Amino acid sequence: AAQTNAPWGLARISSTSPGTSTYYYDESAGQGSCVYVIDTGIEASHPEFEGRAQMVKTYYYSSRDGNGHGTHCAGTVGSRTYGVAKKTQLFGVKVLDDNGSGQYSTIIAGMDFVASDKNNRNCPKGVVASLSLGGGYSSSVNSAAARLQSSGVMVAVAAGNNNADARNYSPASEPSVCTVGASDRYDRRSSFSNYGSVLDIFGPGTSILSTWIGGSTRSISGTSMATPHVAGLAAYLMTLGKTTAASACRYIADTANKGDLSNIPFGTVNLLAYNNYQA
Ligand SMILES: [Ca+2]
What we know:
The protein has 6 helices and 15 strands. With 279 residues, it is of the alpha/beta class. The chain has one domain (1-279): CATH 3.40.50.200. It has a 7-stranded parallel β-sheet with strand order 4-5-3-6-8-10-11, sandwiched between helices. A two-stranded antiparallel sheet has the order 1-2. Strands 7-9 form a two-stranded antiparallel ribbon. It is globular, with a radius of gyration of 16 Å. Calcium ion is lined by residues 174-175, 177, 179, 198, 200.
């Protein structure tokens, strides 16, 4: 399939080179997979989600997204226009309040929630979680992301936006999950992107157009925008039978565009997510 005039990040993800604007992908499109978006929630009613998004959990007075961030992330995973996996099921877990903040204890509970709740969903092709959040190093937070991953969920997490080594952040520093750095449309490391030996992959993170609350759209930037590209890609590859939750991060890094990014510090991977689709 071919989506013309796609957001640059979608095009980039299906291209060997920057500067193109059509997204190419197998039509299966993540059908039969599920993605949990663990964030400020999802505006499920947005026409762009077409009935495929649902809120399954909140730790606050409402399950509605009063911020927009979780909705933007969900749109990059699987909205019809702005999404990598246009046919996946989307499940929202609101661990962040409408200011985008959450206590570590709440965030950990939300991860363990998904690790059980996936047994209540129909996802024959596999399950992914996108965690666009972070804070200082915490072994409890890391350990929670490690459990989610070990229960059979492909876990993708933002590296962080501090322009600093991600070893100092959680769950970014957890070795067993997929830690994702941000790149821009000219294949440069995003200027805010964390880096370090703990990064597994880069995805599009600067000027990313996607869904927002109130039924609209907007462009914003962050490793939190790169993460859902990688999460959407894992779901898409799992429905294609190419990989599994346990090995998707590895597979994505093995099949990535290699050595194409600029401003990667010595010792950080130079790998950019790529769907290897031959149209
Ligand atoms: Ca990691």
